[PDB]
Design an enzyme around this catalytic site. Structure first.
Site, PDB file in Angstrom:
ATOM      1  N   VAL A   1       0.838  -1.178   0.000  1.00 36.48           N
ATOM      2  CA  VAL A   1       0.000   0.000   0.000  1.00 36.48           C
ATOM      3  C   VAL A   1       0.891   1.253   0.000  1.00 36.48           C
ATOM      4  O   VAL A   1       0.444   2.287  -0.495  1.00 36.48           O
ATOM      5  CB  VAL A   1      -1.176  -0.002   1.081  1.00 36.48           C
ATOM      6  CG1 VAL A   1      -1.363  -1.385   1.748  1.00 36.48           C
ATOM      7  CG2 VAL A   1      -1.016   1.074   2.127  1.00 36.48           C
ATOM      8  N   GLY A   2       2.143   1.167   0.486  1.00 33.24           N
ATOM      9  CA  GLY A   2       3.049   2.360   0.584  1.00 33.24           C
ATOM     10  C   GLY A   2       4.498   2.146   1.001  1.00 33.24           C
TER      11      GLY A   2
ATOM     12  N   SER B   1       7.996   0.808   5.055  1.00 37.23           N
ATOM     13  CA  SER B   1       7.013   0.344   4.033  1.00 37.23           C
ATOM     14  C   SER B   1       5.853  -0.445   4.578  1.00 37.23           C
ATOM     15  O   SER B   1       6.066  -1.264   5.511  1.00 37.23           O
ATOM     16  CB  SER B   1       7.702  -0.545   3.054  1.00 37.23           C
ATOM     17  OG  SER B   1       8.427   0.302   2.223  1.00 37.23           O
ATOM     18  N   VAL B   2       4.653  -0.197   4.022  1.00 35.53           N
ATOM     19  CA  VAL B   2       3.437  -0.908   4.424  1.00 35.53           C
ATOM     20  C   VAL B   2       2.923  -1.859   3.333  1.00 35.53           C
ATOM     21  O   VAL B   2       2.844  -1.493   2.159  1.00 35.53           O
ATOM     22  CB  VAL B   2       2.280   0.061   4.859  1.00 35.53           C
ATOM     23  CG1 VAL B   2       0.974  -0.716   5.192  1.00 35.53           C
ATOM     24  CG2 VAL B   2       2.664   0.842   6.048  1.00 35.53           C
TER      25      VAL B   2
ATOM     26  N   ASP C   1       0.447   7.631  13.626  1.00 36.02           N
ATOM     27  CA  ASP C   1       1.684   8.327  14.029  1.00 36.02           C
ATOM     28  C   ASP C   1       1.558   9.231  15.253  1.00 36.02           C
ATOM     29  O   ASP C   1       2.254  10.242  15.359  1.00 36.02           O
ATOM     30  CB  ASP C   1       2.290   9.092  12.842  1.00 36.02           C
ATOM     31  CG  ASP C   1       2.715   8.171  11.720  1.00 36.02           C
ATOM     32  OD1 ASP C   1       2.686   6.914  11.879  1.00 36.02           O
ATOM     33  OD2 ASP C   1       3.072   8.719  10.656  1.00 36.02           O
TER      34      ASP C   1
HETATM   35  C1  LIG Z   1       2.292  10.956   7.474  1.00 38.04           C
HETATM   36  S1  LIG Z   1       2.512   9.918   6.008  1.00 38.04           S
HETATM   37  O1  LIG Z   1       1.191  10.507   4.985  1.00 38.04           O
HETATM   38  C2  LIG Z   1       2.043   8.296   6.576  1.00 38.04           C
HETATM   39  C3  LIG Z   1       1.162   7.555   5.789  1.00 38.04           C
HETATM   40  C4  LIG Z   1       0.809   6.299   6.266  1.00 38.04           C
HETATM   41  C5  LIG Z   1       1.335   5.792   7.465  1.00 38.04           C
HETATM   42  C6  LIG Z   1       0.850   4.461   7.881  1.00 38.04           C
HETATM   43  N1  LIG Z   1       1.533   3.700   8.772  1.00 38.04           N
HETATM   44  C7  LIG Z   1       0.762   2.592   8.863  1.00 38.04           C
HETATM   45  C8  LIG Z   1       1.053   1.508   9.800  1.00 38.04           C
HETATM   46  C9  LIG Z   1       0.999   0.160   9.436  1.00 38.04           C
HETATM   47  C10 LIG Z   1       1.196  -0.785  10.435  1.00 38.04           C
HETATM   48  C11 LIG Z   1       1.395  -0.358  11.769  1.00 38.04           C
HETATM   49  F1  LIG Z   1       1.582  -1.250  12.769  1.00 38.04           F
HETATM   50  C12 LIG Z   1       1.415   0.989  12.105  1.00 38.04           C
HETATM   51  C13 LIG Z   1       1.213   1.916  11.110  1.00 38.04           C
HETATM   52  C14 LIG Z   1      -0.461   2.723   8.046  1.00 38.04           C
HETATM   53  C15 LIG Z   1      -1.652   1.860   7.842  1.00 38.04           C
HETATM   54  C16 LIG Z   1      -2.298   1.289   8.939  1.00 38.04           C
HETATM   55  C17 LIG Z   1      -3.459   0.536   8.736  1.00 38.04           C
HETATM   56  N2  LIG Z   1      -3.951   0.382   7.499  1.00 38.04           N
HETATM   57  C18 LIG Z   1      -3.351   0.926   6.429  1.00 38.04           C
HETATM   58  C19 LIG Z   1      -2.192   1.684   6.576  1.00 38.04           C
HETATM   59  N3  LIG Z   1      -0.313   3.918   7.467  1.00 38.04           N
HETATM   60  C20 LIG Z   1       2.171   6.563   8.274  1.00 38.04           C
HETATM   61  C21 LIG Z   1       2.541   7.827   7.801  1.00 38.04           C
END
Ligand SMILES: C[S@](=O)c1ccc(-c2nc(-c3ccc(F)cc3)c(-c3ccncc3)[nH]2)cc1
Length: 332
Positions: A26-27, A29-30, A160
């Site tokens: 999804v991003g 890294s995620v 965050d």
């Molecule tokens: C500030 S920047 O736009 C930014 C974008 C995404 C994240 C971001 N970090 C996470 C994320 C994933 C797993 C974790 F355990 C903690 C955070 C997610 C996430 C969590 C659940 N479902 C979808 C995505 N998004 C952090 C910073």
């Protein structure tokens, strides 16, 4: 100790248990992935360069420490935490695991036209989370619509929360001001709300000084009352330079929106962080009458953040973290 596959995603490599399947970018890294163990969909985050610098290493322990603490519906928390390595010596990776959410709040104001009742549920949720967060003595500092995860349901959680666009910063952060307070999140929530109700960014500032201008055309120039508190024989100053301004009527600035809401904005978007309404207060506001429920707006356990306050070596931080990874008890 579980069996791990390995596979490569884009340039980033990935080393996770078999209980997670379908890893899907999804991003750090995620990925989105399927948790066989519960059969719920999850987000696995692989921290980038965990223990590179001391600045990373501490940042790592911070993130793990916070996430371990966050137990609340409106606030991202930890389902699982895991490392591929065994023994302290190998440890250089950390994957965090939470409930998948799948859209952030910036791809909502860019999809929908939102109902008043929408902003209601949504902002209530933000302040629900906020308030648990503030009760732990943590301050967000970066609330903006991309740190708010919303799933197809219109359920929302705060991303965050206590790790760290200029558009959502309280003025007092744009004036540095090394030591402020929790109401900085309230300012943002105002900026988010305003935009939810109107479809346009409230203060789309092009830089740090343009932004204090935009803020001012709205909330107006500070009373001698507030002015005095700006620590300057001249950092001050610099404001009074920029022309003197009518505090606009939120009522017109925000024509069409529910006047409950508009009254609510007048109280979040207050130039003076003392007169800014608190989280727990704003939930007792009429705008949330539908949703509010005093016996369901829980506080948090107190959060131990002296760690914040001290200089360890990479080796000392990576060690403490590892302690955190293995000391992890999963929820229900
Ligand atoms: C500030 S920047 O736009 C930014 C974008 C995404 C994240 C971001 N970090 C996470 C994320 C994933 C797993 C974790 F355990 C903690 C955070 C997610 C996430 C969590 C659940 N479902 C979808 C995505 N998004 C952090 C910073």
């Amino acid at each position: 100790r579980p069996t791990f596959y390995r596979q490569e995603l884009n340039k980033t490599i990935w080393e996770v248990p078999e209980r997670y399947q379908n890893l899907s970018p999804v991003g750090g890294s995620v990925c989105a992935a399927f948790d066989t163990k519960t059969g719920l969909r999850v987000a696995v985050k692989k921290l980038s360069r965990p223990f590179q610098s001391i600045i990373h290493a501490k940042r790592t322990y911070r993130e793990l420490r916070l996430l371990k603490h966050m137990k609340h519906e409106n606030v991202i928390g930890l389902l699982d935490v895991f490392t591929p390595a065994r023994s302290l010596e190998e440890f250089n990776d950390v994957y965090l695991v939470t409930h998948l959410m799948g859209a952030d709040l910036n791809n909502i104001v860019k999809c929908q036209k939102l109902t008043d009742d929408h902003v209601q549920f949504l902002i209530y949720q933000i302040l629900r989370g906020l308030k648990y967060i503030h009760s732990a003595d943590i301050i967000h500092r970066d609330l903006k619509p991309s740190n708010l995860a919303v799933n197809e349901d219109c359920e929302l959680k705060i991303l965050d929360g206590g790790l760290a666009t200029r558009w959502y910063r309280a003025p007092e952060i744009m004036l540095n001001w090394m030591h402020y307070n929790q109401t900085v999140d309230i300012w943002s929530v105002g900026c988010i709300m305003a935009e939810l109700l109107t479809g346009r960014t409230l203060f789309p500032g092009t830089d740090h000084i343009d932004q204090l201008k935009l803020i001012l055309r709205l909330v107006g120039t500070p009373g001698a009352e507030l002015l005095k508190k700006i620590s300057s024989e001249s950092a001050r100053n610099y404001i009074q330079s920029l022309t003197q301004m009518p505090k606009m009527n939120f009522a017109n600035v925000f024509i069409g929106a529910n006047p409950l809401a508009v009254d609510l904005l007048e109280k979040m978007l207050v130039l003076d962080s003392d007169k800014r309404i608190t989280a727990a207060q704003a939930l007792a506001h009429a705008y949330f009458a539908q949703y509010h429920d005093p016996d369901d707006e829980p506080v948090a356990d107190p959060y131990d953040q002296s760690f914040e306050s001290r200089d360890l070596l990479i080796d000392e931080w990576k060690s403490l973290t590892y302690d955190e990874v293995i000391s992890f008890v999963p929820p229900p």
